[PDB]
From a paper:
Among all bacterial pathogens, Legionella pneumophila maintains the largest known set of translocated substrates, delivering over 300 proteins to the host cell via its Type IVB, Icm/Dot translocation system. After release into the host cell, translocated bacterial substrates (effectors) regulate one another through several different functional interactions: indirectly, through counteracting modification of a shared host target, or directly through either steric complex formation or direct modification of one effector by another.
We next solved the crystal structure of another novel metaeffector, the previously uncharacterized Lpg1148, to reveal a domain (residues 123–304, Table EV4) typical of eukaryotic ubiquitin proteases (UBP) involved in the deconjugation of ubiquitin or ubiquitin‐like proteins from their targets. The de novo crystal structure of the metaeffector LupA (123–304) was determined to 1.9 Å resolution and reveals that LupA belongs to the ubiquitin or ubiquitin‐like protease (UBP) family of proteins with a canonical cysteine protease triad (inset). In vitro activity assays confirmed that Lpg1148 is a ubiquitin‐specific protease whose activity is abrogated by a mutation within the predicted catalytic triad. LupA activity is specific toward ubiquitin. As Lpg1148 rescues the yeast growth defect caused by LegC3, we hypothesized that this inhibition may derive from the catalytic functionality revealed by our structure. LupA activity removes polyubiquitin linkages from its cognate IDTS, LegC3. In accordance with our model for LupA metaeffector activity, we detected ubiquitinated species of LegC3 in the presence of catalytically inactive LupA variants but not in the presence of the wild‐type deubiquitinase.
Residue numbers in the entry: 123 to 192, 199 to 304
The structure:
C-alpha cells in the first residue's frame, strides 16, 4: 500500500507509438518540471504525425492528461477519485499549453474519473497507469502496445480486493 513513485509509473505506463505520444512523468509542484518539457510538448503539439499526447501528472495523487488533436484540442483530465478532483489540473495544463503556444480558446476541457474508483491515496498511480493503457487502446494503438490485463482489471474491478495493485505488481515483475 505504498504509492507508485516516478520510476514505477515510467516502467508501467504505455510507451509512445506512432501517432500516440506518451510523455514522461510531470511533477506539478516543481516549476522546473513543466519548464523542461515545453519544447518537447510544443514540438509534438505542432507535429502533424502526432495525434494524441498523454501525460502522467504527479507526484503523489497521480492523474492523467490526454490531449487529442482536431481547430480545437480535446483535453481530458482524469482523476482516480472521480472527475470533480481533476479541477486541480485545469490551470496547470492550460498554462502548459499556453507556454507551448496554444491559446486557451482552442482547448476543450473535460474532467473524468473511473467506473470503479477506490478513493484511497495509495492506488492513484495504479488507476492512472491502467487508465492510460485503456486510452492507448481507445486511441487505436495496436494490440501489443497496451496491456489488456490492466485495462480489463480496471474496467471490471477497479482496485477491489487490491486486485489492480496485484496486476500492477505482476506486470511490473514481468517487465523487470
Ligand atoms: Cl475506468
Ligand atoms: Cl493511502
Amino acid at each position: 500500500r505504498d504509492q507508485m513513485q516516478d520510476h514505477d509509473m515510467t516502467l508501467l505506463m504505455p510507451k509512445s507509438q506512432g501517432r500516440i505520444v506518451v510523455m514522461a512523468v510531470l511533477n506539478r509542484y516543481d516549476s522546473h518540471s513543466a519548464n523542461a518539457i515545453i519544447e518537447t510538448l510544443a514540438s509534438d503539439v505542432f507535429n502533424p504525425e502526432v495525434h494524441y499526447i498523454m501525460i502522467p501528472v504527479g507526484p503523489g495523487h497521480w492523474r492523467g492528461v490526454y490531449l487529442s488533436k482536431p481547430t480545437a484540442y480535446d483535453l481530458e483530465l482524469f482523476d482516480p477519485y472521480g472527475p470533480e478532483g481533476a479541477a486541480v489540473l485545469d490551470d496547470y495544463v492550460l498554462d502548459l499549453l499556453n507556454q507551448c503556444g496554444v491559446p486557451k480558446e482552442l482547448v476543450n476541457i473535460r474532467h473524468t474519473g473511473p467506473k470503479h474508483p477506490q478513493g484511497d491515496a495509495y492506488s492513484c498511480g495504479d488507476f492512472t497507469c491502467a487508465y492510460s493503457h485503456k486510452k492507448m487502446k481507445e486511441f487505436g494503438a495496436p494490440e501489443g502496445s497496451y496491456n489488456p490485463i490492466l485495462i480489463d482489471t480496471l474496467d471490471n474491478l477497479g482496485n477491489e480486493d487490491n486486485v489492480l495493485r496485484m496486476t500492477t505488481r505482476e506486470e511490473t515483475r514481468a517487465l523487470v
